[PDB]
Design a protein around this ligand. Structure first.
Ligand SMILES: Cc1cc2nc3c(=O)[nH]c(=O)nc-3n(C[C@H](O)[C@H](O)[C@H](O)COP(=O)(O)OP(=O)(O)OC[C@H]3O[C@@H](n4cnc5c(N)ncnc54)[C@H](O)[C@@H]3O)c2cc1C
Ligand SMILES: NC(=O)c1ccc[n+]([C@@H]2O[C@H](COP(=O)([O-])OP(=O)(O)OC[C@H]3O[C@@H](n4cnc5c(N)ncnc54)[C@H](OP(=O)(O)O)[C@@H]3O)[C@@H](O)[C@H]2O)c1
Length: 356
């Protein structure tokens, strides 16, 4: 029982219908890109990718709509004809049209997004806001990353970054939107790096190529969760941002979320003030800052991730609960951390480590 597609037209519209044959399909299952005359829709179907890739017979307008009938996993993409005339056929198939291929074996697809704003968050970390083009539908699920790509002399360079929410605070958070055009990133600029100095040179209104999402985190790890622990070092905070928002809004069984955030100095605590206000106004959230190398008077915890520190933080309560520990940071920090969680008798199923 394989996926399939069809199409129909009215005087002014062209509709493409994708029949996934799947339950669980939603607007995160499909990415759509199109030009005036070319159309690409990739649909996530279990571990495979179903691709529609067609050069359209006539031109269509930039704005289009995408709708899912969730009972049967039917997706409809409605395009707008530039000229209200009848089409003789949909178009000429292009590379890999109507192909069903395992995701592992697929290549990254990119589209150009526009840099809209850039804000300093710490001395070396910015909040970037990119805007998808009107002719793209793309949602980045919780826990996943995308690759950014920039041209330099002779070539293009690529690095992955993990989209975040625009804020942790409800007054600045975006609402839940049928289709969000904006993607936010917290990105630390390394003066000796290759990619981030070039990203930091980009002017407002210039363009960056953004890949489709990647990553194995599955939101089902949150079903019925009661206690969530978050271990982050440095920019390993970024996957935690959307996880933290979800934890406080979309898990009715959640009793506690605890973040232990490791950094070098007070000035490296990304979003310190936002985390302090969030934690203070919601007793479900605890946040603890650990500094490896404070430069001012510091009453808080100090050091690196250790057997000692996780004993107190992850101390077992008297009652059994459904638990999840997410960890992200420098590779050795995460490898040490996961080794230490196994020593503390957490299962594979109770650990998620965000890595490449
Ligand atoms: C899945 C994933 C998600 C990510 N998400 C984010 C995110 O949301 N935000 C974010 O800011 N970053 C994120 N990163 C890190 C990011 O991808 C880049 O690695 C980072 O931006 C540095 O790239 P660069 O070219 O600027 O620096 P690089 O050229 O890679 O190096 C920067 C500097 O760091 C030091 N360095 C580099 N490599 C090593 C090494 N192996 N050992 C010791 N020191 C080293 C050196 O001083 C080097 O000059 C993510 C990485 C992955 C794999
Ligand atoms: N999903 C992903 O794969 C993903 C997503 C986002 C970010 N990341 C990764 O997270 C990393 C964060 O980099 P950063 O520059 O922001 O961190 P950083 O500020 O240089 O360091 C953050 C904290 O981690 C500590 N630390 C560093 N290496 C350690 C080790 N081996 N053992 C124990 N503690 C260690 C530091 O201690 P010291 O003071 O001793 O240096 C510091 O307190 C990047 O490598 C990035 O690629 C990965």
């Amino acid at each position: 029982s394989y996926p399939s597609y069809d199409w129909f037209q009215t005087d002014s519209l062209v509709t493409i219908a994708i029949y996934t044959k799947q339950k669980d399909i939603n607007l995160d299952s499909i990415i759509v890109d199109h030009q005036n005359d070319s159309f690409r829709a990739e649909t996530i179907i279990k571990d495979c990718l179903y691709l529609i890739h067609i050069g359209l017979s006539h031109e269509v307008q930039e704005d289009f709509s995408v709708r899912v009938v969730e009972s049967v996993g039917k997706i409809e993409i409605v395009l707008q004809k530039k000229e209200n005339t009848s089409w003789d056929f949909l178009g000429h198939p292009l590379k890999n049209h109507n192909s069903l291929i395992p995701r592992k074996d697929t290549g990254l697809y990119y589209r150009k997004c526009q840099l809209i704003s850039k804000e300093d968050v710490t001395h070396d970390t910015r909040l970037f806001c990119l805007m998808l083009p009107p002719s793209t539908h793309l949602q980045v699920p919780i826990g996943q990353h995308v690759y950014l790509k920039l041209p330099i002399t002779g070539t293009e360079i690529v690095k992955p970054y993990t989209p975040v929410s625009g804020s942790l605070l409800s007054e600045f958070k975006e609402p839940v939107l049928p289709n969000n055009k904006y993607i936010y990133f917290l990105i630390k600029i390394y003066p000796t790096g290759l990619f981030t100095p070039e990203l930091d040179r980009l002017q407002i209104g210039d363009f960056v190529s953004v890949s489709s999402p990647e990553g194995n985190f599955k939101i089902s790890k949150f079903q019925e969760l009661e206690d969530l622990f978050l271990l982050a070092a440095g920019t390993g905070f970024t996957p935690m941002v959307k996880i933290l928002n979800y934890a406080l809004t979309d898990i009715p069984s959640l009793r506690k979320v605890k973040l232990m955030f490791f950094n070098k100095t007070e000035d490296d605590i990304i979003w310190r003030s936002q985390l302090e206000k969030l934690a203070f106004k919601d007793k479900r959230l605890d946040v603890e800052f650990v500094l490896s190398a404070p430069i001012s008077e510091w009453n808080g915890k100090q050091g690196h991730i250790s057997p000692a520190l996780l004993s107190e933080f992850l101390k077992r309560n008297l009652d059994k609960s459904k638990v999840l520990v997410c960890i992200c940071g420098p590779v050795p920090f995460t490898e040490q951390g996961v080794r230490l969680l196994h020593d503390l008798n957490f299962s594979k199923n109770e650990i998620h480590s965000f890595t490449a």
